[PDB]
């Protein structure tokens, strides 16, 4: 019941295969809107993203989809952990650089295992996130609605 399988590729940091699972507002048609390999082209401060997200909500013209990335093999998990640490240690989110036509933005959010879910994504509309979990990379997908 995964939505998408592909690469996350951040040059000179980590490249690995992951499955994306639904968390909130993430229909399976997202598979059509994600490339084979998500290219991480930048980093951005979380507060800047949350400010943007509340303007996005006010516009009524986008859908905010949250997915959970899972490494597919033990080798993938090693790189997944590198990339989590890259963003976590800098207090940054990743920014995708190669979005398909229907995707306005995609951000990569490191969610610590005991972290509280960043409040703009609450509440989830979908399976949500379990309380007991590893360190996670979430994908915040800003998709064209109308």
């Amino acid at each position: 019941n995964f939505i998408w399988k592909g690469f996350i590729n951040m040059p000179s940091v980590a490249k690995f295969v992951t499955k994306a699972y639904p968390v909130s507002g993430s229909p399976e048609y997202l598979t059509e809107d994600l490339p084979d390999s998500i290219q991480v082209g930048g980093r951005i401060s979380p507060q800047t993203v949350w400010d943007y997200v509340e303007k996005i909500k006010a516009s009524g013209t986008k859908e905010i989809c949250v997915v959970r990335f899972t490494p597919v093999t033990e080798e993938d998990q090693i790189s997944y952990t590198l990339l989590f640490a890259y963003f976590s240690s800098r207090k940054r989110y990743g920014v995708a650089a190669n979005n398909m036509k229907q995707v306005k933005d995609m951000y990569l959010i490191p969610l610590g295992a005991t972290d509280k879910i960043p409040h703009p994504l609450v509440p989830f509309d979908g399976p949500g996130l379990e309380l007991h979990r590893p360190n996670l990379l979430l994908g915040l997908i800003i998709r064209q609605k109308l």
Binding site: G42, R43, V49, K104
Partner: peptide
């Protein structure tokens, strides 16, 4: 009305 994506630092 369409908010512009915020700038970010490239890596």
């Amino acid at each position: 009305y369409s908010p512009t994506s915020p700038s970010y630092s490239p890596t």
